[PDB]
Amino acid sequence: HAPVVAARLRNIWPKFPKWLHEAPLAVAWEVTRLFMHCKVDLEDESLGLKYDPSWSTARDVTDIWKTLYRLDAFRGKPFPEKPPNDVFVTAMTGNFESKGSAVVLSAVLDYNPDNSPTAPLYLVKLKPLMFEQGCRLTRRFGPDRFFEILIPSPTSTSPSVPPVVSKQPAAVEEVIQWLTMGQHSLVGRQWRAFFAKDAGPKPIIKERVHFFAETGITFRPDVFQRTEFKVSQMLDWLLQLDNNTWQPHLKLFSRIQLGLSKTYAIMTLEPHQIRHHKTDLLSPSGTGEVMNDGVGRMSRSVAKRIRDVLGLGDVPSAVQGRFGSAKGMWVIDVDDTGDEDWIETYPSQRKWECDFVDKHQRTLEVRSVASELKSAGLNLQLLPVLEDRARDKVKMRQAIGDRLINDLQRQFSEQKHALNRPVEFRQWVYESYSSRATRVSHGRVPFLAGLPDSQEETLNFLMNSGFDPKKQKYLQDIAWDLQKRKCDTLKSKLNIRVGRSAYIYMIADFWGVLEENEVHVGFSSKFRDEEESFTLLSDCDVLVARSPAHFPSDIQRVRAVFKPELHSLKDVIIFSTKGDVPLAKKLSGGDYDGDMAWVCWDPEIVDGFVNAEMPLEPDLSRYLKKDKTTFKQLMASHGTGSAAKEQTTYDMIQKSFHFALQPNFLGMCTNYKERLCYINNSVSNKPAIILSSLVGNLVDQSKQGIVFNEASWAQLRRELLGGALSLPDPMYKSDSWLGRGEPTHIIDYLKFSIARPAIDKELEAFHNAMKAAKDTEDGAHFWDPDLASYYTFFKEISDKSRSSALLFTTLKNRIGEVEKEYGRDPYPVRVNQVYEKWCAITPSKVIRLLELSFLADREMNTWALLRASTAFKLYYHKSPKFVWQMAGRQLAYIKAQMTSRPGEGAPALMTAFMYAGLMPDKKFTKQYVARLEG
Amino acid sequence: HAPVVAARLRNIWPKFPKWLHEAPLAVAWEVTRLFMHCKVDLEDESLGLKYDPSWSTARDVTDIWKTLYRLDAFRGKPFPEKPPNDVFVTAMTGNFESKGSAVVLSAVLDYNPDNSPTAPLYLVKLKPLMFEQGCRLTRRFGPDRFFEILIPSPTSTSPSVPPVVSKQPAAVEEVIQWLTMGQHSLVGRQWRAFFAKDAGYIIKERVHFFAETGITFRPDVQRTEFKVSQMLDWLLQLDNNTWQPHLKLFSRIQLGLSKTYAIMTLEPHQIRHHKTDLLSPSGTGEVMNDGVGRMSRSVAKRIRDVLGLGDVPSAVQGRFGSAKGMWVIDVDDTGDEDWIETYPSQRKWECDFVDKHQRTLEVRSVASELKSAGLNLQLLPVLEDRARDKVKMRQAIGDRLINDLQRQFSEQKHALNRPVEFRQWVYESYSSRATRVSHGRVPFLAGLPDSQEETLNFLMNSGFDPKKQKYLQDIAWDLQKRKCDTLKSKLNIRVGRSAYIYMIADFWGVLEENEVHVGFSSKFRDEEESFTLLSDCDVLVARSPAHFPSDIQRVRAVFKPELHSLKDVIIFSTKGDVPLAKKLSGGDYDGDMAWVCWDPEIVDGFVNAEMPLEPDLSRYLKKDKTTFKQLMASHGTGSAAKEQTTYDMIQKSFHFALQPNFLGMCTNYKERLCYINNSVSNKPAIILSSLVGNLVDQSKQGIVFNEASWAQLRRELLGGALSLPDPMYKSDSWLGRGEPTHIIDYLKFSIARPAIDKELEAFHNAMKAAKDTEDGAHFWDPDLASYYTFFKEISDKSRSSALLFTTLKNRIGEVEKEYGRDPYPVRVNQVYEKWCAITPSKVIRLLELSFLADREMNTWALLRASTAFKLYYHKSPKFVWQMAGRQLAYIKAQMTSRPGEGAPALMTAFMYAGLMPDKKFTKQYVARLEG
Ligand SMILES: [Mg+2]
Ligand SMILES: [Mg+2]
């Protein structure tokens, strides 16, 4: 209770008018969206609202917007963005649920740029209805009963946050109280907060908050759509609270995320089909150490059901999932020769005490599956530890630079060779980037004005109509904008490719075949590395790591040993359950609940590496303070019985929100450590070991109830290190070397001595080159006489003209006006505005032939061809980007028309849909070129 | 000798003029491939000879005949097949070799339809110059010194053979004598015969000649005179191999002719000749690695390098000096030195390995990624013979087949319901990639692709729907009907978990006797399941064909981590009494592939039989073991004696190679008798299996087996005499008394046929769908009359465009009538040409767009297409689609376009040809469509 805030925090939500009370939920949502967007008051008695019965039977939101919009006070604009039909229909008529998909209600709040109280404080924008995979909780209670927002973090220091908040210490407590203390009215439902978490110049970080529709004007009581139901009951259903009062309440709150986890429901197992183990697999040496933390077995038939319901090409050996209170990985049991369904759970997987009685507690839900692997490369954060652990550091660093030079050289040579033939460049462009998901989503290649959205898609669209990247400069320009952007990425990220490396799910050996420093890695298919291929790993040393590696010991060198017993387990890496300490825990305190290891079998990288033992970590208890307060201790303030328990549940939500919304120091302490280790050039001295241990403890902050605030951070740097004082940014944060003399630090050296010269050298190759193209014949020009085809045709006519003539003059004039418009807000919207003026350039008997009005799509007429070519003749000069962006599409048609030859096959006019479904045939390319080359 | 036949063959070959002794060998070819076709001769007179040149410096062909025909001349329908430029260039300027390819001189002889005696007997046609992979012999002596012909076999037997030869018994000796006794003049060279064998593909035999001299050669002891006897002595180092049976020695000549890639020449210190093979550990003395040896890892990387393979191959089939067989990477090789070994069982003659060409590794083939083999019908009788429960075996195979049949019929019918899906199915139903590669586009006949399948996709890609447009519906139907025929004629048992795999022997002592190791180079996919290797299961292995009950064996797949690096080969134990390979129809490790099957249903019921007690067939099978040394005894000693002995061996061995092949005949008899007996394990079956097994090695075993022997065998051990009928399953229908009882009969006629016929009833019930079910699919499409209606509207206030439109309709009508009225593609073209001939101030300039080099991209072509459609969709649907399909598709794609719903794409013919349907798009897109 500040109050300052309030009154601000009014009144934050859009009102729900009486004329709109006959819903339905989806209409209410999407109509409210048109009103907020157009800036139209929903409690306006000047507009004569109303309620279109027709909206009730609507299957396209555009129908409940063209209403409307109409009215005159809606124009505007167009948009909102608009929910897809299939989504809208599901929300309207399919229960907010389409197979596995939930319809999602979401909003983003940004600080009100306004001011004074009684202005809101937050502006709310409602997202369009959308599909996202469901979760336990939306399958149990209905997707329509869940609402999520992104909201500016109230403890965000700083400086672009309103004064009103935080120069008024605690009302951080007022914001949370607003969030949690009562219900929020939105679109005729009563929403109550039950979860908060971090989100999925310098902006204010937002936190994601989840609300449950406890009631609304359509619900009904109760005990004993759609029935009233409290958040305390919902969470009791999820967590079986009666049996979990012993738990620290912050930790218990953190388990709510397991009901929100986006997962595929696979199958419900019978009780007799479930094996709950009372004990984990423990260290053989008596350390009491858990050797299979987060991992269990499943039967083979269970894994086949997962292939089945998910539609996988193959039975997966392991999956990341949930099952009642159990969370982690399940791996097929290699000893299963039966065909009966079963699964097991271990104490380390079970996050609360669950009776596993209702079918939703006994349903296997899949988050992700072990899939075919792809090369990982080397991230620059691994480098300092790799260098630290090198038997010889000068050679390590010479080698890593050579590798980066070579890989770069290698990717340039392949690009420039492929460029020499359209079939080959198309194949290279296709392989460089996946567009299939975009294509599946739109039922076509999406266009911005006259060309595809995507640069890659633009290249192939144009080459498929006969343009040549070595002949047309525009194709050339894009081809190298692309190679530039990729150089930028390499110097920023230093993602040096290492062909023999992959991220692989870690699994523990239940079967007792791997000795302590042995790992088993078999692949589901051929893993290719330039000249060499692998279906498995055997008799070689490998490096394993989890990202991020901080301690010198966070990367380990071990022996890859293929065990025939584990032959069936593919695309996972199995660690021994022998020894004192599981290998997983040595890899940055990891485990087997979904962790993936960086696995590297590259000889040059593996062979110079020397293992370090675990660090003696410091006691940080003075700075890191765990709140261990249990649900039982919170309930003692209210007493005993159902009302006591209900209020305790809400206490837990409120205290845990107050915890979740505190600043994240993980990021801050990680950056300090980056900076400190950089200046010291050491990842193994005492300060380095202290900070690595620090950030290691902050990773589990949320479920450990670790309190760590600003005063404690300062105290810890004061007492154990620095340099309150900002440490300078590493030099490698800048684009050019701003250091003194030669780079000494390995990242500076790799970015500045190696990558930057090599890039600029590789770019001096084809600017050279440009330049070498006047008329060697080759080279690459903007001009193409083929595309002035219709121009010259109608100028001849035009001559000759009378008055075609006049038509042709207006045309050139209008194009000129629109190029001027192109010369002068987000980018795609502005381009569209110009595209629309472009399309508005419109024309007995000559106009009828140019117009072909029997075609519903204007942009397929002969006029569009003429307009495109005239614009080309006039502007290929001059404004090359203007012409291609507006008319790319018809330039392509003209090109395919013009290059066609009698008796040399037929050009194909493909529908947008049918075109999106084809891919380059790599065998064709390869075989066709092979015959071209004798 | 033999009175006639001579001189009824002493010209045969041109006929090599004054006068063209000059100008490169290629030029000559090639020119003497013109008196050949078409005519002229020797021999003149008229009209002008010798020189051009270029000719004597050309780079085409092509040309040359462009000198030609002065002449005038012929004028003989200017068409010889014609050698490719790069080939001709190589033969002209590149030594007949580039770099791995040899230029090949070949001809085909057919019997002279003429007669009597002074006429040739053979007509010879010279093939155009061509590239083929070289061999040891062309690399050593030059591809230009070798000439090969196909020649009718003088011992066939019969009917369509000239009189002329047999019934003049033993002029078969006269033909061979002609072939071998002396030199043959051809294009200015003197060719001598040194090898004969059966053809690569009245049966003809392939004969090989070597240019011993010619009017460009030079004395000794381009280039130099050299005898066939010297060339063979270089190859086989005859001095040290006189101990060999001369037929077997002759057989080894094939090793010099084997088409191989030269990889690298190893130094002497890098070669390891073992004096002994790996022998049975039981003391049987059996060779356990027959035909196989190890190579170092660096050698195998050199093979990947020079062959441009994507990976190091674990094993290769090759030659190396006298050694023939497989070489496998030594898994124990941790060095990087080049080495190879040879074994007695690999070495086919005593070789010093001195010459670089005796020490060059030559690759015939390499172990490559595997694909599914399925089950060959020939294996079924033995699978059934060895079934623990034959009733259950037969039932599973039929169930397997019924299910496959119903699956593939239901999949076509389902795919039909969505154009993305039907396009995918159509694409997967037949491969068009090679046609597309060859043409640089999809070939069209008139207005539509050549191919029905390509037509379906072309039309669907512009927006037509096979459930809506009857034209597409009729084609799809036609394809299934057509597929049904093929199924009835081609019984197919489908088995995903099987492959043919190169057999290799375990040099490393890790596999127990009934264990095999199989690792794959990549994922071997079978519908629901994938394998990168085989472990902990039983597998069946066999070599095709399997004859004896024991020719298929069930063994244990055990993955040995020591052998993990060996991929796409199967490794057999070198323990036990007898090598597994030998049990697989007398096989070995020199290139044999095993049928490997790990399908549980097929493996499970199988019970191993032991090796059969084979009968003594000495009386019928007669081995001539006469050695080269015994042949040489009739001439004496020294170089002259040796030379004539070599020619002796060619003559004698030609006489042996040209005798009828009974392997085929005895194999057919066995199939027919075992079918009648419904037994592959009774006494006549064992006798016939043992017979054909002995006939496989006939050539290098010098086994003589003629008609008298075959008839005596049949008489004594069998058998009619008497022609066995064909098995019922060689006829298309069952005819056939009652129910099929033979397993193949049962599967074909009792299982497959009733399923196929139940499916020809499904389609025919849907033919009568039909009337006006509103679906129905129709020929009518108002989209396709687009331009028609547009121009009738303009022609209404005509005045003028009316007249233009009236001529158009008229001329289309004339061409429709022409379509109503040789071969097929030629006639269609004629009509297409008249159709394209239908051609048109400002309106005609807009319709014509003459700046377009391709007429058929005109707005007029669109107008012509739709007015033809409007006027004829009803009456002559095939006419309009055949002529105008192309533009009907353009119209459809234009019409069907909607603003803000994406852009149609005008693809070039070439760029369209290089795209395939994306299976993942199909699959993901429909998944989204279905909620
Ligand atoms: Mg974990
Ligand atoms: Mg063999």
Numbering used by the authors:
A (entry chain A): 390 to 589, 604 to 627, 641 to 1240, 1252 to 1270, 1282 to 1372
B (entry chain B): 390 to 590, 607 to 626, 641 to 1240, 1252 to 1270, 1282 to 1372
Quote the original article.
We report the 2.3-Å resolution crystal structure of QDE-1, a cRdRP from Neurospora crassa, and find that it forms a relatively compact dimeric molecule, each subunit of which comprises several domains with, at its core, a catalytic apparatus and protein fold strikingly similar to the catalytic core of the DNA-dependent RNA polymerases responsible for transcription. A cell-encoded RNA-dependent RNA polymerase (cRdRP) is also involved, in plants, fungi, protozoa, and certain animals, but apparently not insects and vertebrates, producing dsRNA triggers and hence amplifying the PTGS response. The polypeptide chain then leads into a “catalytic” domain (residues 647–807; 914–1,161) that houses the three proposed catalytic aspartic acid residues (D1007, D1009, and D1011) within an active site cleft formed between two DPBB subdomains (DPBB1, residues 690–792, and DPBB2, residues 916–1,018). Overall, QDE-1 exists as a compact, but flexible, dimeric enzyme with metal binding sites confirming positions of the catalytic sites but with extensive additional structure whose biological functions are less immediately clear.
The structure was then refined against a higher resolution dataset extending to 2.3 Å. The refined structure at 2.3 Å has an Rwork of 21.7% (Rfree = 26.4%), and the stereochemistry is good (root mean square deviation [rmsd] bond = 0.013 Å, rmsd angle = 1.9°, 2.3% of residues are in disallowed regions of the Ramachandran plot; Table 1). The proposed dsRNA product binding channels are not identical in the two subunits, because the disposition of the domains is different: subunit A has a “closed” conformation, with the head and slab clamped down on the active site cleft, whereas an 11° rotation of the head and 2° rotation of the slab render the B subunit more open and provide space for an RNA duplex. Analysis of electron density maps showed a Mg2+ ion coordinated by these aspartic acid side chains (the functional significance of this is underscored by the observation that the QDE-1 polymerase activity is dependent on divalent cations).
